[PDB]
Protein backbone atom coordinates (compact mmCIF):
# COMPACT_ATOMS: atom_id res chain seq x y z
CA UNK A 1 0.00 0.00 0.00
CA UNK A 2 1.05 3.54 0.84
CA UNK A 3 4.16 4.42 2.83
CA UNK A 4 5.59 7.40 4.65
CA UNK A 5 8.94 8.49 5.93
CA UNK A 6 9.19 11.08 8.69
CA UNK A 7 11.86 12.77 10.76
CA UNK A 8 10.89 14.06 14.20
CA UNK A 9 13.10 16.73 15.79
CA UNK A 10 12.83 17.94 19.38
CA UNK A 11 14.97 20.76 20.81
CA UNK A 12 14.61 21.60 24.52
CA UNK A 13 16.21 24.49 26.21
CA UNK A 14 17.29 24.13 29.86
CA UNK A 15 18.77 27.36 31.28
CA UNK A 16 21.40 26.73 33.93
CA UNK A 17 21.78 23.12 32.74
CA UNK A 18 23.86 23.53 29.58
CA UNK A 19 22.92 24.12 25.97
CA UNK A 20 19.59 22.96 24.46
CA UNK A 21 19.29 19.23 23.89
CA UNK A 22 18.54 18.12 20.29
CA UNK A 23 16.97 14.72 19.51
CA UNK A 24 16.07 13.39 16.08
CA UNK A 25 14.39 10.11 15.15
CA UNK A 26 13.52 8.81 11.70
CA UNK A 27 10.60 6.52 10.90
CA UNK A 28 9.41 4.58 7.89
CA UNK A 29 5.69 4.01 8.58
CA UNK A 30 5.60 2.80 12.22
CA UNK A 31 9.21 1.51 12.23
CA UNK A 32 11.90 3.69 13.77
CA UNK A 33 15.18 3.34 11.87
CA UNK A 34 17.64 6.05 13.09
CA UNK A 35 18.20 8.21 16.14
CA UNK A 36 20.46 11.11 17.12
CA UNK A 37 20.78 12.60 20.61
CA UNK A 38 23.08 15.57 21.28
CA UNK A 39 23.38 14.40 24.90
CA UNK A 40 24.91 11.01 24.04
CA UNK A 41 28.56 10.54 25.04
CA UNK A 42 29.57 10.33 21.35
CA UNK A 43 26.62 11.81 19.50
CA UNK A 44 26.18 10.24 16.14
CA UNK A 45 23.44 9.18 13.94
CA UNK A 46 22.78 5.61 14.93
CA UNK A 47 20.87 2.65 13.40
CA UNK A 48 17.65 1.41 14.99
CA UNK A 49 16.48 -1.07 12.30
CA UNK A 50 18.52 -3.97 10.84
CA UNK A 51 17.88 -2.95 7.22
CA UNK A 52 19.57 0.46 7.64
CA UNK A 53 22.83 -1.14 8.85
CA UNK A 54 23.95 -1.97 5.30
CA UNK A 55 24.32 1.75 4.53
CA UNK A 56 28.02 2.54 4.31
CA UNK A 57 30.16 4.95 6.31
CA UNK A 58 29.51 7.81 3.87
CA UNK A 59 25.83 7.52 4.81
CA UNK A 60 26.45 7.66 8.56
CA UNK A 61 29.02 10.46 8.29
CA UNK A 62 26.59 12.57 6.27
CA UNK A 63 23.65 11.98 8.63
CA UNK A 64 25.82 12.75 11.65
CA UNK A 65 27.09 15.99 10.14
CA UNK A 66 23.52 17.07 9.32
CA UNK A 67 22.39 16.35 12.87
CA UNK A 68 25.27 18.36 14.33
CA UNK A 69 24.50 21.31 12.06
CA UNK A 70 20.80 20.99 12.91
CA UNK A 71 21.69 20.95 16.63
CA UNK A 72 23.39 24.34 16.23
CA UNK A 73 20.60 25.77 14.03
CA UNK A 74 17.95 24.67 16.52
CA UNK A 75 19.87 26.24 19.41
CA UNK A 76 19.96 29.56 17.51
CA UNK A 77 16.27 29.19 16.65
CA UNK A 78 15.35 28.65 20.30
CA UNK A 79 17.15 31.91 21.17
CA UNK A 80 15.31 33.69 18.36
CA UNK A 81 11.91 32.30 19.43
CA UNK A 82 12.44 33.37 23.03
CA UNK A 83 12.98 36.90 21.72
CA UNK A 84 9.91 36.84 19.46
CA UNK A 85 7.70 36.02 22.43
CA UNK A 86 9.46 38.41 24.87
CA UNK A 87 10.16 35.44 27.10
CA UNK A 88 12.46 35.31 30.11
CA UNK A 89 15.80 33.63 29.62
CA UNK A 90 15.09 31.59 32.78
CA UNK A 91 12.35 29.44 31.26
CA UNK A 92 12.57 26.09 29.49
CA UNK A 93 11.09 25.91 25.98
CA UNK A 94 10.57 23.27 23.28
CA UNK A 95 10.83 23.50 19.49
CA UNK A 96 9.56 20.51 17.49
CA UNK A 97 9.70 19.74 13.79
CA UNK A 98 8.32 16.88 11.73
CA UNK A 99 8.84 16.51 7.98
CA UNK A 100 8.82 13.84 5.32
CA UNK A 101 6.96 12.37 2.41
CA UNK A 102 4.13 9.96 1.63
CA UNK A 103 4.22 7.70 -1.43
CA UNK A 104 1.55 5.54 -3.01
CA UNK A 105 1.76 1.85 -3.95
CA UNK A 106 3.63 2.85 -7.12
CA UNK A 107 6.20 4.93 -5.27
CA UNK A 108 4.98 8.30 -6.55
CA UNK A 109 4.80 11.24 -4.19
CA UNK A 110 1.40 11.60 -2.60
CA UNK A 111 2.36 14.71 -0.59
CA UNK A 112 5.14 16.24 1.49
CA UNK A 113 5.12 17.60 5.03
CA UNK A 114 7.12 20.10 7.04
CA UNK A 115 5.67 21.59 10.19
CA UNK A 116 6.89 23.09 13.45
CA UNK A 117 5.56 23.71 16.96
CA UNK A 118 6.85 25.92 19.80
CA UNK A 119 5.99 24.89 23.38
CA UNK A 120 3.54 22.35 21.97
CA UNK A 121 1.61 24.87 19.84
CA UNK A 122 1.58 24.84 16.04
CA UNK A 123 3.93 27.59 14.88
CA UNK A 124 4.57 27.39 11.11
CA UNK A 125 3.80 24.77 8.47
CA UNK A 126 4.71 24.32 4.84
CA UNK A 127 1.47 24.17 2.85
CA UNK A 128 0.64 21.15 0.68
CA UNK A 129 1.70 23.16 -2.39
CA UNK A 130 5.29 23.05 -1.03
CA UNK A 131 5.58 26.74 -1.96
CA UNK A 132 3.97 28.82 0.82
CA UNK A 133 3.70 28.81 4.62
CA UNK A 134 0.89 29.06 7.16
CA UNK A 135 2.11 31.06 10.19
CA UNK A 136 0.21 30.78 13.45
CA UNK A 137 0.86 34.26 14.85
CA UNK A 138 2.93 37.43 14.46
CA UNK A 139 6.07 35.70 15.72
CA UNK A 140 5.78 32.99 13.07
CA UNK A 141 5.26 35.76 10.52
CA UNK A 142 8.81 36.93 11.33
CA UNK A 143 10.06 33.42 10.62
CA UNK A 144 7.97 33.28 7.45
CA UNK A 145 9.54 36.55 6.25
CA UNK A 146 13.05 35.20 6.92
CA UNK A 147 12.29 31.97 5.08
CA UNK A 148 10.65 33.78 2.15
CA UNK A 149 13.91 35.72 1.71
CA UNK A 150 16.09 32.61 2.12
CA UNK A 151 14.15 30.63 -0.50
CA UNK A 152 13.30 27.94 2.06
CA UNK A 153 10.11 26.74 0.37
CA UNK A 154 12.00 26.01 -2.85
CA UNK A 155 14.62 23.97 -0.98
CA UNK A 156 11.95 21.94 0.81
CA UNK A 157 10.12 21.19 -2.42
CA UNK A 158 13.34 19.98 -4.05
CA UNK A 159 14.06 17.74 -1.07
CA UNK A 160 10.55 16.37 -0.58
CA UNK A 161 9.95 15.59 -4.28
CA UNK A 162 13.50 14.31 -4.84
CA UNK A 163 15.78 12.93 -2.13
CA UNK A 164 12.96 12.15 0.32
CA UNK A 165 11.02 9.87 -2.01
CA UNK A 166 14.13 8.29 -3.54
CA UNK A 167 15.48 7.29 -0.16
CA UNK A 168 12.09 6.10 1.04
CA UNK A 169 11.90 3.89 -2.05
CA UNK A 170 15.38 2.57 -1.25
CA UNK A 171 14.51 1.85 2.41
CA UNK A 172 11.29 0.11 1.37
CA UNK A 173 13.22 -2.23 -0.93
CA UNK A 174 15.98 -2.88 1.62
CA UNK A 175 13.47 -3.55 4.40
CA UNK A 176 10.83 -5.14 2.20
CA UNK A 177 10.48 -8.32 4.27
CA UNK A 178 9.30 -6.20 7.25
CA UNK A 179 8.33 -2.73 6.03
CA UNK A 180 6.10 -4.23 3.33
CA UNK A 181 4.62 -6.98 5.51
CA UNK A 182 1.33 -6.27 7.27
CA UNK A 183 0.80 -8.46 10.35
CA UNK A 184 -2.90 -8.96 11.14
CA UNK A 185 -4.20 -8.66 14.68
CA UNK A 186 -4.80 -11.75 16.75
CA UNK A 187 -8.30 -11.07 18.10
CA UNK A 188 -10.55 -12.31 20.91
CA UNK A 189 -13.24 -11.13 23.34
CA UNK A 190 -12.98 -11.37 27.13
CA UNK A 191 -15.78 -11.06 29.67
CA UNK A 192 -15.39 -9.36 33.06
CA UNK A 193 -18.41 -9.38 35.42
CA UNK A 194 -18.86 -6.06 37.20
CA UNK A 195 -21.96 -6.74 39.29
CA UNK A 196 -25.11 -8.84 39.15
CA UNK A 197 -26.35 -6.30 36.60
CA UNK A 198 -23.46 -5.65 34.21
CA UNK A 199 -20.30 -7.08 32.69
CA UNK A 200 -17.49 -5.70 30.54
CA UNK A 201 -16.93 -7.17 27.09
CA UNK A 202 -13.40 -6.34 25.94
CA UNK A 203 -12.32 -6.88 22.35
CA UNK A 204 -8.55 -7.40 21.94
CA UNK A 205 -6.28 -6.95 18.92
CA UNK A 206 -2.71 -8.11 19.49
CA UNK A 207 0.46 -8.45 17.48
CA UNK A 208 -0.52 -6.26 14.53
CA UNK A 209 1.55 -4.03 12.26
CA UNK A 210 1.19 -1.27 11.16
CA UNK A 211 -0.49 0.60 14.01
CA UNK A 212 -3.52 1.82 12.04
CA UNK A 213 -6.55 -0.23 13.11
CA UNK A 214 -10.28 0.20 13.57
CA UNK A 215 -11.94 -1.56 16.48
CA UNK A 216 -15.65 -0.95 17.13
CA UNK A 217 -18.48 -2.43 19.19
CA UNK A 218 -22.01 -2.69 17.82
CA UNK A 219 -25.18 -3.41 19.79
CA UNK A 220 -27.95 -4.86 17.61
CA UNK A 221 -25.93 -3.70 14.59
CA UNK A 222 -25.61 -0.06 15.76
CA UNK A 223 -22.22 1.47 16.60
CA UNK A 224 -21.70 2.16 20.30
CA UNK A 225 -19.24 5.02 19.89
CA UNK A 226 -20.38 7.05 22.92
CA UNK A 227 -20.36 3.96 25.17
CA UNK A 228 -17.06 2.31 24.12
CA UNK A 229 -13.87 2.69 26.11
CA UNK A 230 -11.03 2.63 23.58
CA UNK A 231 -7.44 2.63 24.83
CA UNK A 232 -4.74 4.26 22.79
CA UNK A 233 -2.91 1.88 20.47
CA UNK A 234 0.26 0.83 22.29
CA UNK A 235 3.55 -0.78 21.23
CA UNK A 236 4.31 -4.32 22.33
CA UNK A 237 8.06 -3.73 22.03
CA UNK A 238 8.55 -6.32 19.26
CA UNK A 239 7.57 -4.18 16.26
CA UNK A 240 3.89 -4.84 16.82
CA UNK A 241 0.98 -3.05 18.45
CA UNK A 242 -1.94 -3.78 20.78
CA UNK A 243 -5.33 -2.21 21.33
CA UNK A 244 -8.60 -3.00 23.04
CA UNK A 245 -12.15 -1.65 23.06
CA UNK A 246 -14.59 -2.27 25.88
CA UNK A 247 -18.32 -1.86 26.47
CA UNK A 248 -20.34 -2.38 29.64
CA UNK A 249 -23.29 -4.60 28.83
CA UNK A 250 -26.35 -5.78 30.77
CA UNK A 251 -25.99 -9.29 32.16
CA UNK A 252 -27.54 -11.79 29.80
CA UNK A 253 -27.39 -9.42 26.79
CA UNK A 254 -23.82 -10.32 25.72
CA UNK A 255 -24.88 -11.97 22.45
CA UNK A 256 -26.41 -8.72 21.15
CA UNK A 257 -22.89 -7.24 20.94
CA UNK A 258 -20.38 -7.71 18.12
CA UNK A 259 -16.81 -6.48 17.81
CA UNK A 260 -15.70 -5.36 14.36
CA UNK A 261 -12.02 -5.22 13.41
CA UNK A 262 -10.47 -3.64 10.31
CA UNK A 263 -6.75 -3.88 9.59
CA UNK A 264 -4.58 -3.85 6.47
CA UNK A 265 -3.28 -7.36 7.26
CA UNK A 266 -6.72 -8.97 7.31
CA UNK A 267 -8.04 -10.62 4.13
CA UNK A 268 -11.50 -9.43 5.24
CA UNK A 269 -12.79 -7.42 8.23
CA UNK A 270 -13.60 -9.52 11.28
CA UNK A 271 -16.72 -9.80 13.40
CA UNK A 272 -16.29 -11.30 16.87
CA UNK A 273 -18.61 -12.19 19.75
CA UNK A 274 -18.09 -13.23 23.36
CA UNK A 275 -17.83 -16.95 23.17
CA UNK A 276 -18.52 -18.43 26.60
Amino acid sequence: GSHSMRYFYTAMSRPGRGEPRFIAVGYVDDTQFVRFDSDAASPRMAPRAPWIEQEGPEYWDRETQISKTNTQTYRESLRNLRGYYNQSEAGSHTLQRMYGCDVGPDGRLLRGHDQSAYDGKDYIALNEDLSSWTAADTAAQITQRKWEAAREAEQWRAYLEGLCVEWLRRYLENGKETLQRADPPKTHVTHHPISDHEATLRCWALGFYPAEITLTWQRDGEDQTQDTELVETRPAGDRTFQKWAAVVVPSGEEQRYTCHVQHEGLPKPLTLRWEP
Partner: peptide
Protein backbone atom coordinates in the same frame (compact mmCIF):
# COMPACT_ATOMS: atom_id res chain seq x y z
CA UNK B 1 18.07 10.64 4.32
CA UNK B 2 17.69 13.91 6.22
CA UNK B 3 17.35 17.44 4.96
CA UNK B 4 20.15 19.82 5.86
CA UNK B 5 18.39 22.55 7.84
CA UNK B 6 20.46 25.73 7.82
CA UNK B 7 17.76 28.42 7.95
CA UNK B 8 17.12 29.52 11.53
CA UNK B 9 13.64 30.37 12.71
Amino acid sequence: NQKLIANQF
